[PDB]
Each structure stands twice: as C-alpha cells, then as structure tokens.
Amino acid sequence: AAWVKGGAADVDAAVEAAADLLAASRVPVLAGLSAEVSALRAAYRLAETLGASLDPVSGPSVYAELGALSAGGAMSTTRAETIGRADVILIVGNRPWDGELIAEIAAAAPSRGRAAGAERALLSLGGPQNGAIRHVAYAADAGGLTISLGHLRAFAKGHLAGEAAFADLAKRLFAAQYGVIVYDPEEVGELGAEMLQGLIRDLNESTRFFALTLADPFQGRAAVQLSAWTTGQAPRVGFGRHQPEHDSWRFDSARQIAAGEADAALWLASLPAPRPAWLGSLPTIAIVGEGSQEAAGETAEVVITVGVPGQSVGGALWNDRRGVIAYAEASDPETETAAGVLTRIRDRLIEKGVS
C-alpha cells in the first residue's frame, strides 16, 4: 500500500507523485540506500537520469575507512581466516565486542595455516577490562584510541624507550605468525585507521599481519561495491553534469540538508535503518519495508511500502559473516520491490522528458 498527501493508497499514482516531486526540484538527493543491490542499482540509475546526489546512511563509517585507504592503502584479511589462522589478535575499541566474532575466536584455536593449533593470545586496546572471555587488556590513552594507536606504532618502530605498557604490546605483536588487528573505522576515525594501517605495514617487516575492518550493518559496504563498478567512483556521487562527480563533502546528505541546498530527497530503506529526522522538513519520497514503523503516511510526502529482502522477498544483501554480497531468499514470504519502484519512477521521469 502507498500513501500520497493524505493517505492515497494507489501504488501507481504514488509513483507519479514521486516523479512530479523529483522533476520540480533542482537539487535532488537519494539518501538511505539500505536495500538490495538491485535497488541500489536502480537508485543509481535513477540519479543518473535525474541529476541527483546519493548518500548511504553508513556514510560516516564508510568514508572513515575509504578516506584512509584511498590515500594510504590497506593490508586486510577476512573473518574466516582470522578465526582460522590468526594466533595473536588485537581488538581495538569496544564495537568489535558486540558481535559473536570475539567469542568464535576465543572458543577455538586456529585450524589452518602455520600457527594452526597453537595457543591463542587475545590483546585488547580500549576494550573492557573485565570480560567473560579471558584476554589481555591494555589501557587506552587519555587522548583516545586514535592517540593510543599512534603511541603504539612508535614502540613498534623502535622510536620510544622500553618498559612501557605499549612496549610490551609491541613485543607481543612482532612475535606473531598470523596477526590480525580488529577495529571499527567508525569509532577509530580516518586518522586512526591510516595510522592503524601504517602500524600493520611496520609489523609486516617481520611477520605477516592484517586488519579486520569491521563492516557497517546498513548495506553501506555493498553500496561501495556496486557504485564502484557502475559509476567508476565510491558513493556520494552527483550527476548534475551528466558525469559522476565524486565529492565526499559536497554530496554528504547530512551536510546538504542542514545548509538548505537540497529541495527534495528520496529515502531508500527496505531494511531497517535509523530515521534521518529531516523527512518532514523537505518534500521526501520514502521507499520503506512493510514491517517497518516508517510505513505510515505521516513520515514523508510520498511513502511506498516494498518487500523486506531476506524476510518477505528475495534479494542480494551484504553477508556479515561471509564479508561479500550474497543472495538471501525470503524466510517464509504480488508484493512490490524497491528496485521495481525506483525503475518505474525512472521510467515515468523519462516519459515526461519526451513530451
């Protein structure tokens, strides 16, 4: 069911109302982008015809990692190979402790590689001092994790005197066979990640070390993958000049809305995502799942309920465990898809351009 103005149920007419809203605006925005790859593909295809900008909700976490690797590069590994091969694991921050990943590592020793079957050492920087899982915790510096990360690299480079807290940590890291530093780029920051990735480059002068960059839970990592092969650049790209302009600052939806540059915006949230709270200020088109609380017609000017991928309809989603795009079939599900709506709005916008 759809909603236009005061509760207009018709799905076809809601597509026409969304096409009229996007055509009348000069600066359009496509925020959210938490859905299937087919919907992301249709959203980027619509923005190319519209001349709009895009910004996933995972924006800050995505560009915290992208900002450090587009300038400094990366030395990374996967979750399965960390559980399978790593003998010493450094856990930076509190966010990696949320998932079951930390318990899977502790429960079983590595099963593959040179260090398979050896005793596993778990070191933590900035994590809780007392945990159910036994680990060696190292106190974070007063400045923060980013200051601690730079502090730690100095001991690893041999630039700072011995007998310090991070000096023992540096000694334990270099004495490795398969080293993995697990961190969340959101909480660590662009500068800390580039430092963290540099610390790994210094560690690889002696033994093999890698980074387990944590993934966002709002499909942002798949949006990067798709946008990269569709536009040639990362997300936050604008098509005002028919060519994809990448500008992490200019096409930041949070920045655009607060300044007042964007007239209209399209919200893509087939899977649960945090509400942006600006939907009421400017005319918005909300493509959301049927189960979500955002289904009601008060949230946005035009609201279209689509099929939740992995629950009511099939779709290729980012797999948290696997670390790649995988197709998730519907768990006990004719309903409309977010890709089918964005394509129909694009077809109606093209139809208006001819006559």
Instruction: Please list every residue from 163 through 222 that binds other proteins, using CB under 8 A.
Output: 177-178, 191, 194-195, 198-199, 207-208, 210
In the stretch 63-102, what mask flags binding to other proteins with x, by CB under 8 A? x--xx-xxxxxxxxxx-xx--xx-----------------
Nearest approach in angstroms of CB 293 to other proteins is 28
Applying CB under 8 A, among 33, 91, 215, 234 the residue interacting with other proteins is 234
| Separation between Cα atoms, residue 339 and residue 325, nearest integer Å | 17
Applying CB under 8 A, among 34, 38, 61, 305 the residue interacting with other proteins is 38
Applying CB under 8 A, among 60, 99, 131, 240 the residue interacting with other proteins is 240
Contact between 254 and other proteins by CB under 8 A: the answer reads no
Give the count of residues interacting with other proteins (CB under 8 A). Answer: 90
User: For 165, how many CA atoms within 13 A lie in the half-sphere containing its CB?
Assistant: 12
Q: Sign of the C-alpha dihedral, residues 133, 135, 141, 142?
A: positive
> Of 27, 1, 34, 93, which is closest to residue 282 (Cα–Cα)?
27
| Separation between Cα atoms, residue 212 and residue 95, nearest integer Å | 13
Contact between 229 and other proteins by CB under 8 A: the answer reads yes
Which is it for strands 237-238 and 245-246: parallel, antiparallel or unpaired? antiparallel
Nearest approach in angstroms of CB 299 to other proteins is 26
* Dihedral in degrees, nearest 10, Cα atoms 121, 123, 129, 133: -40
Nearest approach in angstroms of CB 82 to other proteins is 9
Q: Which window, 88-96, 139-147, 265-273, 297-305, contacts other proteins (CB under 8 A)?
A: 139-147
Nearest approach in angstroms of CB 24 to other proteins is 10
| Separation between Cα atoms, residue 331 and residue 256, nearest integer Å | 38
- Looking at the Cβ atoms of 4 and 203, the one nearer to other proteins is 203
Applying CB under 8 A, among 16, 20, 48, 290 the residue interacting with other proteins is 48
- Looking at the Cβ atoms of 297 and 309, the one nearer to other proteins is 309
Nearest approach in angstroms of CB 113 to other proteins is 6
Q: Where are the beta strands (DSSP E) in 209-301?
A: 209-213, 237-238, 245-246, 264-269, 284-289
Contact between 138 and other proteins by CB under 8 A: the answer reads no
Q: Where are the beta strands (DSSP E) in 126-262?
A: 136-138, 179-183, 209-213, 237-238, 245-246
338 CB burial (10 A radius; 0-12, 13-18, 19+): buried
Residues 281-310 that bind other proteins (CB under 8 A): none
The DSSP 8-state label assigned to residue 111 in this structure reads: -
* Dihedral in degrees, nearest 10, Cα atoms 252, 235, 245, 38: -120
Contact between 248 and other proteins by CB under 8 A: the answer reads yes
Contact between 246 and other proteins by CB under 8 A: the answer reads yes
